[PDB]
Structure formats: C-alpha cells, structure tokens
Write an enzyme that holds these catalytic residues in place. Structure first.
Site, short mmCIF file in Angstrom:
data_model
loop_
_atom_site.label_atom_id
_atom_site.label_comp_id
_atom_site.label_asym_id
_atom_site.label_seq_id
_atom_site.Cartn_x
_atom_site.Cartn_y
_atom_site.Cartn_z
N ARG A 87 0.83 -1.20 0.00
CA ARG A 87 0.00 0.00 0.00
C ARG A 87 0.87 1.25 0.00
N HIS A 138 7.83 2.32 5.04
CA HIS A 138 7.47 0.95 5.33
C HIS A 138 8.63 0.25 6.03
CE1 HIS A 138 3.84 0.72 2.58
NE2 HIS A 138 3.47 0.02 3.64
N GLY A 139 8.31 -0.54 7.05
CA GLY A 139 9.31 -1.18 7.86
C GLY A 139 9.26 -2.70 7.76
N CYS A 154 6.00 -0.11 9.22
CA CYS A 154 4.68 -0.47 8.70
C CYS A 154 4.77 -1.88 8.13
CB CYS A 154 4.21 0.52 7.62
SG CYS A 154 3.08 1.83 8.17
#
Ligand SMILES: *CC(=O)N(c1ccccc1)[C@@H]1CCCN(C(=O)c2ccc(N3CCOCC3)cc2)C1
Lengths: 209, 207
Positions: A36, A95-96, A138
């Site tokens: 996303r 984003h992680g 994320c």
C-alpha cells in the site's frame, strides 16, 4: 544528573525522511507485489516539522526516497561540519520490517547501516553530541557500539503523533527524552510497541525556554 | 506521571545465573576449544545479590548452568504465581556471541528465547509489572513486543558500576533509566544497550 549540551541556536538539523509513493516498489520487487502507498504520512511529517522547529532544530526534509536516495542524503550530513551544532536528529517515515527499512524503490536499508553512519570515527565533529533516530515502520544490532546514541524505533501495521504531543508538552517543562518515551510507551499500550534502545551517557532535553 | 508499583515484601525474585566453569564447553564444543573460565565473575554475583537483597528481592543464585538448566530455571519462574510480587529480575553472567549466550557446555541460547518466556500470555501472573533483565556476556530481536520490559545488556565495568550506582541512587528515588544513563558514562571512557518497553517510571524504594 548530567545533561547534554542542548543550548544553542539552532541546536541541530532535524532530518525528516518521509517516503510515501512505493510505486516502483510495487513494480520492481515481487514479494512486495501489493504494498500500500503510505498516504497519511504528512500528518506525521508535519508534526515532526512542528515540534522540532519549536525546539530550535532546522528541519531539512525529504519526501519519497530510494535507498540510494536515502543513503546519499546522510553522507551530506555525515561529512558536514557539525562543530557549530549541539545535537543531530533523524526521522524516517517509511514501510518497515524486521531490522530494515524499505525505500520507495522497494529495496532495503538496515537500521544498523543508517545509524552507523554517524560515529566518532566517521562523524568526528558530531562526537560527544547526542545522535537521535526516530523511526516508524509499517507492514545484528540496530546501533553502533558507541556512546551518545538513541533509537526511538516502532513498528506499525499513533506513535509519531503521541511522541510529538509529549515533546510539545513536556519539553518546555524540562523533562528528558527518556521520560518522554516511557510516557509514549504507555500512551499506545491498551501491542505493536516501540522499543527505545540507547547508549546515551547523560540526560538529553530540548529546552523551549 | 506514573511509577510502577514497587511496594512489596518481597519485591520479587532476582535470578542470578552465574556461568564460570566452561570446562564442559571446552570438553565437547570444538570451536570453544580454549574458551576461558570466567574468573572473577564471583565478584559481580555477590554485588548483584547484595544490591538486590537490599532492594528487598529474594535472590535465587545459580552457578555454572548449562543450556537446559537455564531453559528449566526460567521455566520454573515462568509458570510461577507472582501475584503477590511487583517485579521480576533476572541476571545472567556468562559469555556468548552477539545474540546468544553460552551455557557451561558451550551450547547456545538466544536472548530473545529467554526474555520471551515471561510474556503476559506465557506468565499471566506477571502481566503489567516490570520484567527486568541484566546480561553481561563477554565476546533477530531481543525482547518481545509486549510492554513492561528492560534489557540492560552489555556486549563485552558494567555490573560493578550498575550496582554501585544502584545502591547509591535508588534510595534517592531515581528512575532506572536515570541509573542506566549514569553507568553509561562510567563505562564510556564495549557499550551497554538498554532496550526498554516500560509504560511507567521504575524505582526500587529502599525504605
Ligand atoms: C567477561 C568477564 O569475565 N569480565 C568482564 C570483562 C570486561 C568488562 C566487564 C566484565 C570480568 C568480570 C569480573 C571481574 N573481571 C576481572 O577481570 C577480574 C578477575 C579477578 C580479579 N581478582 C581475583 C579475585 O577477586 C578479586 C580480584 C579481579 C578482576 C572482569
């Protein structure tokens, strides 16, 4: 009771890295076929500009960064002469994953490869000065084996929101960053918990007075 | 401005795993052929007992523990009913790689696999109350994503300054982070790395 040298004008650069469009990620990387787009990050980004300009850091923000884009950005500040500064802050909003961060190209930067840029043996003008990292993920270690380090790391699937609120709140009162983080830890558990890890020698406060 | 409830007699258990005789490690694991016996570790241990027995902790010392001895000692207190305790402390003096620890037989144990025993789910009697870990191993994740943990670990002094600055300051009512930040400067001039997920402040009243 020893406190870090917070007092200066400005106190330091507040790097804000603010990835959002993981389009090339969705294309160039298979396993992230359907990642996303991290919209809504500007609320985190804006707050991070807000709180930290108030605390006398000059925000230098970047949006939508590749890993290569992310990596060259920090050399600018590793090689910079920090002698006139008092501290150094770097926020990463992307984003992680487990121990890594994703760039908008879908490639990866380990949390240790980014922190390790700013050592004493690599960034001498910023030695003995505190070096802070706030990261929000994320869906080895994370810090060089050296003093004067803080890593406010979390993993989403609001942390930066509450962190800002406690910073705006507590900082002119003279509470230190560790006090703020415990207050932030409570302010989310009701458990994708942030795990602050640090090697700071002395108290770190951002005086608004 | 909250503080973990620490008023409790006893405050809690205080494990002290103390590895010294690594003969079995040399005896069986070949890459640990010449792994030195941890001479002098019998000085950290006493300081820890003395430090935490003053802080009203029932010390539970354990010397020269292998890997299943460790997995079994944690197993005991994992299943225990700490409902009348207000804290859980576990000290480990031994040595290992960057993430593991070596039992006295050279067998490994990831530190996560240790801290992960005292979950809320895995130890409901210890929900919402500090589970503190101190680790001094001489030369991935480290603590679960649940609240109320502290991991004062040192890749390798640390425990002697941790104790000295603990008996010196805990009477004055200072927070654990204040203490841990102090032992950093003493060690500073290799470095301990306290990861912590605590919701309130944490003091050990001396009374
Ligand atoms: C890994 C280890 O065993 N350490 C260590 C090393 C570096 C940093 C932290 C910890 C030991 C821990 C205990 C003390 N120590 C010594 O080197 C030592 C050993 C013996 C003594 N003697 C002998 C009898 O007791 C009193 C004095 C002193 C110091 C480091």
């Amino acid at each position: 009771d020893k406190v870090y040298q917070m007092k200066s004008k400005p106190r330091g650069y507040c790097l804000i890295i603010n990835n959002h469009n993981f389009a090339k990620a969705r294309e160039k990387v298979p396993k992230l076929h359907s990642i996303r787009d991290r919209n809504g990050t500007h609320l985190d980004a804006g707050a991070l500009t807000t709180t930290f300009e108030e605390l006398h850091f000059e925000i230098k923000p970047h949006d939508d960064c590749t890993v290569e884009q992310i990596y060259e950005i920090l050399k600018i500040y590793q090689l910079m002469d920090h002698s006139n500064m008092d501290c150094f802050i770097c926020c990463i909003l992307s984003h992680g994953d487990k121990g890594i961060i994703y760039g908008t190209d879908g490639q990866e930067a380990p949390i240790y490869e980014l922190t390790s840029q700013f050592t004493g043996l690599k960034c001498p003008s910023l030695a003995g000065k505190p070096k802070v990292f706030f990261i929000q993920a994320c869906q080895t270690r994370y810090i060089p084996d050296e003093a004067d380090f803080l890593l406010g790391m979390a993993t989403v699937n609001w942390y930066i929101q509450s962190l800002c609120q406690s910073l705006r709140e507590r900082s002119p009162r003279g509470d230190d960053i560790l006090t703020i983080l415990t207050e932030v830890n409570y302010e989310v558990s009701n458990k994708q918990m942030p795990q602050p890890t640090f090697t700071l020698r002395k108290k770190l406060v951002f005086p608004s007075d």
